[PDB]
């Protein structure tokens, strides 16, 4: 969000937000799919890796190009910049590739059903299957996996390069204006470490969050179209939308409740940072000049470093009991909802695995907030330090 | 492995290694089970969480205690020390708890067979199952998961405390001899953070390595006793130990070929570190003086940071094609070995899932060397910096 890169850190983010929301609303519910009426949109989608060129996807690709092109033109003429190409188009392409990989995930999920149905048939009757069919099934799966591998590799290359361009942009800005900026103590640490740590952490957190939201939106309709087979949940009974309600409640209450039981922690982390810095700064003075050792003083400083460093190891069991309980119940909560439906014999081995995998993929893509402590510990420290390091 | 902690970093580690080897040779293959001859070790093992009190385990608990007791006693007498209790016995307890958690993993593995056999019966002949059986299966699974939760929480508490004792030990050793150590450049930085970073990282890597070896050793006999139901491998025909051979080759060769094709990376990372540090020092002069800014030289230093630091971004696609190919093919290579057996109808749904889970657990617990890269970038740097900071 600096002035060197991302043309204007003011109205820009509001503009991006309002345009993204308007375009989503027009496409989803406003029936933009009447573009599908202009063309011969068949609307039936294969399961092979010939999925990604049928007209249904190709219309979407063209539509995405049109939107980003318009939004880019407006800021290319309203107020220019030096790194506009990277700051606009690079971010557009990163978002698009994240969406694409989510779609590959959905494709494999849709493949899970016929395979396990074929296995059930083969087990129950040795007199109907032959090995060629199994070889063909593995054939289609590898057909998809090849495209997943290529996209993932190229994407990692590009994101790393874009992050480096951010780093060089703010380094150019900071070194253009050194004379005024020279006299602030510890500037070399700033201009050498803070920029890179800042850029990388920001990129990582942003992409993780957008991936989470896109996974949720991508998998809700499948659950809606597949919940026609599971009418009755075990204890409550019969609910019109048992699966979708249960999935949303489990996932979102799991995360929300898991990140409210562990709310005190960033305060403790900050306090520990402060006391560490005080001990360090005291130790610097005794390096260069007269005694400044003062064993009583060092003992006092260390005891302060200690007593305030145990409280973090104790207000932290509360946060591991909850996490492990949630993570260990989750292995069988996905399959606990299908006892009465299995007994009633409506779902078959192959419609059970789709559901188990839907729940597992949503859980495996909603793991970020257990690894999101970094952004609540080091990123705010860097932002406060680096902004305070500007007049 | 310093002098203040760990009584003598010389003969201690060698003595511990050879004593571990002697004890294992006595128990595993030399016929230690004859202690189970003296007492009434039935040798039959339940499936619930009542597994861990039967004599079959309780003997092993007693034998582990005796071995560690003897080893620790010899060193208590031969070479006394101050942190001897933490240094000897804390390490003993961490090893033991890691083995215990591996055992919990094995128990849940052995549980997946009856549950899936039950589901197959419930789908193929609905009049033979009534729902209370499903509820009892869930009951026993939660019975195990509870013990997993409690042990994990307590173990994390203890590990954190042991690491902080390592830190306080080497801090006291360094700060006792400050005066001779006073004039080295940057004493405060070293004695302020390198101690913690070194101790914590060494702990994490040691535990991960031991974890991998114990998972492999614990899961081989299962595959030996369970490879009798899969006579024919897919193409090569009939091989006496087809399953175990295939598992070993796939896992170990996968890691070996993954960590030999990405061997050039540590040198490039170290070079980038060195050039960035040179830039740092060159800027530091320009912080107090006047004629050190020198935009030409700063330009040259930045270009050195640029040209050199793209090679790393490029000799990284090579290491990311291999990792993704391996991690994708593994999703179906586990089930590719059971096609002729499935077609012939020899295995039942329940030896399919137990084998697939064996392969999945070995692979998922051998995930270290793609995330234990740290030993190639910082820990070596920290050890070298902190040893050279010691005359």
């Amino acid at each position, epitope marked *: 969000m600096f002035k060197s890169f991302f043309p204007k850190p003011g109205t820009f983010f509001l503009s991006a937000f309002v345009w993204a929301l308007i375009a989503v609303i027009f496409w989803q519910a406003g029936g933009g799919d009447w573009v599908a009426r202009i063309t011969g949109a068949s609307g039936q989608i294969p399961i092979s890796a010939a999925r990604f060129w049928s007209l249904d996807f190709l219309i979407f690709y063209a539509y995405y190009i049109v939107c980003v092109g318009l939004f880019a033109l407006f800021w290319f003429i309203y107020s220019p910049h030096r790194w506009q190409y990277w700051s606009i188009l690079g971010t557009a392409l990163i978002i698009f590739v994240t969406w694409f990989l989510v779609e590959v995930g959905v494709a494999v999920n849709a493949w899970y059903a016929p395979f396990y149905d074929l296995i059930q048939t083969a087990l129950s009757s040795p007199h109907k299957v032959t090995i060629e069919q199994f070889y063909r099934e593995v054939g289609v799966f590898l057909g998809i996996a090849l495209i997943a591998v290529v996209i993932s590799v190229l994407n990692n290359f590009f994101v790393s390069h874009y992050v480096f361009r951010w780093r060089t942009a703010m380094n150019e800005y900071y070194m253009a204006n050194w004379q005024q900026l020279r006299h602030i103590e510890g500037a070399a640490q700033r201009v050498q470490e803070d920029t890179m740590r800042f850029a990388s952490t920001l990129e990582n957190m942003g992409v993780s969050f957008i991936n989470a939201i896109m996974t949720l939106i991508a998998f809700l309709p499948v659950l809606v179209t597949l919940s026609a087979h599971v009418p009755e949940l075990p204890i409550i009974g019969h609910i019109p939308y048992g699966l979708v309600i249960a999935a949303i409640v489990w996932s979102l209450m799991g995360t929300g409740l898991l990140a409210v039981v562990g709310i005190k922690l960033p305060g403790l982390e900050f306090k520990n940072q402060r006391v560490e810095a005080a001990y360090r700064k005291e130790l610097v003075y005794g390096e260069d000049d007269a005694t400044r050792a003062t064993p009583p003083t060092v003992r006092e400083l260390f005891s302060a470093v200690r007593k305030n460093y145990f409280r973090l190891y104790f207000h932290y069991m509360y946060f591991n009991i909850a996490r492990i309980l949630y993570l260990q119940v989750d292995n069988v909560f996905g399959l606990f909802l299908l006892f009465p439906s299995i*007994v*009633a*014999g*409506t779902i*078959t081995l192959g419609l059970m695995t789709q559901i188990t995998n839907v729940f597992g993929q949503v859980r495996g893509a909603f793991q970020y907030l257990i690894n999101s402590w970094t952004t609540l510990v080091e990123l705010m420290s860097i932002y406060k330090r680096l902004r305070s390091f500007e007049h | 492995m310093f002098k203040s902690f760990f009584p003598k970093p010389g003969t201690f580690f060698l003595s511990a290694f050879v004593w571990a080897l002697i004890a294992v040779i006595f128990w595993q293959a030399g016929g230690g089970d004859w202690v189970a001859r003296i007492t009434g070790a039935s040798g039959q093992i339940p499936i619930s969480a009542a597994r861990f009190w039967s004599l079959d385990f309780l003997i092993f608990y007693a034998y582990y205690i005796v071995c560690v007791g003897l080893f620790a006693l010899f060193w208590f007498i031969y070479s006394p020390h101050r942190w001897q209790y933490w240094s000897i016995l804390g390490t003993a307890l961490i090893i033991f708890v890691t083995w215990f958690l591996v055992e919990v993993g094995v128990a849940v593995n052995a549980w997946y067979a009856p549950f899936y056999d039950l589901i197959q019966t419930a789908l193929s*002949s*609905p*009049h033979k199952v009534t729902i209370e059986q499903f509820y009892r299966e869930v009951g026993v699974f939660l019975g195990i998961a509870l013990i997993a939760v409690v042990i994990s929480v307590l173990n994390n508490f203890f590990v954190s405390h042991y690491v902080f004792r390592w830190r306080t030990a080497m801090n006291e050793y360094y700060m006792a001899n400050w005066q001779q150590l006073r004039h080295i450049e940057g004493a405060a930085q070293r004695v302020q953070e390198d101690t913690m970073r070194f101790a914590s990282t060494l702990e994490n890597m040691g535990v991960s390595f031991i974890n991998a070896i114990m998972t492999l050793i614990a899961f081989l006999p299962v595959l030996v006793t369970l490879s009798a139901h899969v006579p024919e491998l897919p193409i090569i025909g009939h091989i006496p130990y087809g399953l175990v051979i295939a598992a070993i080759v796939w896992s170990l060769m996968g890691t070996g070929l993954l960590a030999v094709v990405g061997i050039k990376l540590p040198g490039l990372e170290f070079k980038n570190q060195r050039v960035e540090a040179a830039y740092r020092k060159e800027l530091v002069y320009g912080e107090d003086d006047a004629t050190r800014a020198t935009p030409p030289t700063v330009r040259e230093l930045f270009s050195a940071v640029r040209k050199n630091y793209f090679r790393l971004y490029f000799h990284y696609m090579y290491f990311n094609i291999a990792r993704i190919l391996y991690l994708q093919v593994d999703n179906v290579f586990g089930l590719f070995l059971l096609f002729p057996s499935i077609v012939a109808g020899t295995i039942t749904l329940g030896l399919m899932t137990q084998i697939t889970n064996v392969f999945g657990q070995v692979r998922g617990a051998f995930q270290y060397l793609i995330n234990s890269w740290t030993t190639l970038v910082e820990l070596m740097s920290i050890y070298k910096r902190l040893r050279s900071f010691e005359h």
Partner: antibody
Amino acid sequence: LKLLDSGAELVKPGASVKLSCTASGFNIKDTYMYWVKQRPDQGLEWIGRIDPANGNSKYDPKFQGKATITADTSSNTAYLQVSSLTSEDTAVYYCARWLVRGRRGTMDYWGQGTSVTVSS
Amino acid sequence: DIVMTQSPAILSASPGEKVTMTCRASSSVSYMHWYQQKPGSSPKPWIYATSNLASGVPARFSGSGSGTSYSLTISRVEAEDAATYYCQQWSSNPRTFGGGTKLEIKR
């Protein structure tokens, strides 16, 4: 409960016949509906069954390829189709119903049977 | 095919007495049932899974056993119980009936 088998039926050698068994008083989504044959030697035999909830069937391997069982949950009913009648298909055929979900009461109830006579 | 052998194939009794019949399997079954067919009528369970009596029938009918050997006992045969008693196993998917033992009443 009430099961109402069809009426008696004489047929010509080599032809085929279709039989029906209508159930009133319960919902056939909860049950099996098998069939049983009783030749004049009073020994009983098993022919096949069907689960109307999803539509699977299983047959006695000796009787496979001879007679097929189909159902229709719209109007509670099951049907059995015997083909290539020979001199050895003079018998009586009884439907049934076995509870599999919602257990209570008599767990098996037999219809009334439809004499089948084949000759010239 | 589990072959059920059933004996004695003829029986006799008088009111007030006690009688037994046996339907011995040929492997493990665990699932059996006992019927009763009168002349010109359709069969009818008595015992479900070899212990549980079905809906209201006189309490003199009961049987027991496990493994591969079972028995049925009629406490006090009376004038209304001339019939033919079958047995049905159930634990496979072909299913095999039994032989039937015509029961008589003396006078």
